[PDB]
Amino acid sequence: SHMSICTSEEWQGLMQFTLPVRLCKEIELFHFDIGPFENMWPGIFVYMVHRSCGTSCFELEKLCRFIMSVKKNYRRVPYHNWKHAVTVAHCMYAILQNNHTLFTDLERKGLLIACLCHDLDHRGFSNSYLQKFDHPLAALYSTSTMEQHHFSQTVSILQLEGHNIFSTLSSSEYEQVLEIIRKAIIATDLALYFGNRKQLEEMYQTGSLNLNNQSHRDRVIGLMMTACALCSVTKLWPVTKLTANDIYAEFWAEGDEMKKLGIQPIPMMDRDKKDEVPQGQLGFYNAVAIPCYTTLTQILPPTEPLLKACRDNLSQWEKVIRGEETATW
Ligand SMILES: Nc1nc2c(ncn2[C@@H]2O[C@@H]3COP(=O)(O)O[C@H]3[C@H]2O)c(=O)[nH]1
Ligand SMILES: Nc1nc2c(ncn2[C@@H]2O[C@@H]3COP(=O)(O)O[C@H]3[C@H]2O)c(=O)[nH]1
Numbered sequence: 001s002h003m004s005i006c007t008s009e010e011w012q013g014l015m016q017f018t019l020p021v022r023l024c025k026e027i028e029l030f031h032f033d034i035g036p037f038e039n040m041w042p043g044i045f046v047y048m049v050h051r052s053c054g055t056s057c058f059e060l061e062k063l064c065r066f067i068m069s070v071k072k073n074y075r076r077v078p079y080h081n082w083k084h085a086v087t088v089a090h091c092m093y094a095i096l097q098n099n100h101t102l103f104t105d106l107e108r109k110g111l112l113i114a115c116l117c118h119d120l121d122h123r124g125f126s127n128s129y130l131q132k133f134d135h136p137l138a139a140l141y142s143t144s145t146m147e148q149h150h151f152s153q154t155v156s157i158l159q160l161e162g163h164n165i166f167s168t169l170s171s172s173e174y175e176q177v178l179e180i181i182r183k184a185i186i187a188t189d190l191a192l193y194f195g196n197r198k199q200l201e202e203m204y205q206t207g208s209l210n211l212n213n214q215s216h217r218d219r220v221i222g223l224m225m226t227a228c229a230l231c232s233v234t235k236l237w238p239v240t241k242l243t244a245n246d247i248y249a250e251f252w253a254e255g256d257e258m259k260k261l262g263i264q265p266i267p268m269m270d271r272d273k274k275d276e277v278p279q280g281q282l283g284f285y286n287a288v289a290i291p292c293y294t295t296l297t298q299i300l301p302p303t304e305p306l307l308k309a310c311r312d313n314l315s316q317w318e319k320v321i322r323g324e325e326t327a328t329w
């Protein structure tokens with residue numbers, strides 16, 4: 001295998017980890033911020049899987065090896081890191097806890113794993129960069145470049161000794177869950193969000209949306225994945241602002257690399273144009289975040305708290321633009 005593998009101490013440590021009792025009820029909520037509980041992150045994921053699919057959904061030892069190896073294969077980049085992975089998985093958990101009867105046991109397992117692995121081995125570089133500089137990854141994966149790589153790395157971890165949490169599924173269900181995971185991870189490519197949201201809006205408005213129609217179902221799951229991947233915009237303001245700093249730290253590092261190679265970066269990736277960030281955020285919320293959560297709320301109403309939170313943060317960015325912001329840290 002070309003993947004890094006967890007050590008015995010790492011996975012055995014997770015197997016023995018116990019979440020504090022009082023914290024459990026907080027994990028059920030949409031706005032929960034895992035930020036202040038780093039040592040507990042892998043344990044929070046185990047808990048979410050168990051509450052969603054039962055204590056025997058996966059053999060515990062294999063699940064712990066899988067989680068700790070996934071952690072080891074996320075890089076030390078500013079944003080697309082291990083913290084992000086667990087944050088996205090938690091949003092999926094909150095959505096599922098409020099819509100669990102609409103999804104099968106197989107889909108719940110697949111989606112939680114897809115979320116934990118959706119940015120596996122991210123290098124801190126965008127698909128735009130990889131394609132622009134003809135990186136080998138872009139030759140191998142023409143579109144949704146990094147996302148196809150993330151799925152390939154996910155399959156690779158399952159192949160590590162004692163890491164295949166899905167081997168006990170029948171051969172048909174095994175193939176089915178890998179497909180759910182592949183489509184879900186690919187769905188996190190924002191380039192695909194615009195078309196997917198437009199199609200879902202048409203399906204919903206014409207009254208043709210049918211959750212039992214597999215093609216419709218795949219699209220709903222795709223929008224759910226987008227919603228989870230974008231969830232930093234659904235946290236309490238200070239948490240959302242702190243995360244934005246990480247997002248931009250990564251964007252700016254990419255812009256720095258571009259300048260070194262003679263290609264000027266777009267303003268968003270230019271460290272010297274940080275004054276444009278508030279307006280950029282307004283643009284992003286208006287073009288992507290708000291419509292995403294608006295459509296998600298239409299199709300799955302219990303997800304409304306995410307939309308409400310996004311609207312609140314849009315209002316905070318507007319305050320920044322008007323020069324009304326309080327103190328930021
Ligand atoms: N590179 C690599 N190392 C492995 C593999 N399987 C086991 N190891 C390593 O072997 C080590 C044995 O002791 P450990 O502390 O459990 O940590 C283990 C890993 O670091 C593998 O497939 N690839
Ligand atoms: N490369 C590597 N494999 C290890 C290590 N410890 C255990 N292994 C396992 O031993 C196996 C020997 O055959 P393999 O196909 O190379 O796959 C290897 C791993 O599954 C280690 O430190 N490095």
Ligand SMILES: Nc1nc2c(ncn2[C@@H]2O[C@@H]3COP(=O)(O)O[C@H]3[C@H]2O)c(=O)[nH]1
Binds near residue numbers: 190229230268281284
């Ligand atoms: N592209 C983009 N992403 C943003 C912006 N503000 C926040 N984000 C989030 O940061 C993420 C960075 O990686 P991404 O996969 O491109 O998805 C991005 C969004 O979820 C913005 O202005 N542009």
Ligand SMILES: [Mg+2]
Binds near residue numbers: 118119146188
């Ligand atoms: Mg990604």
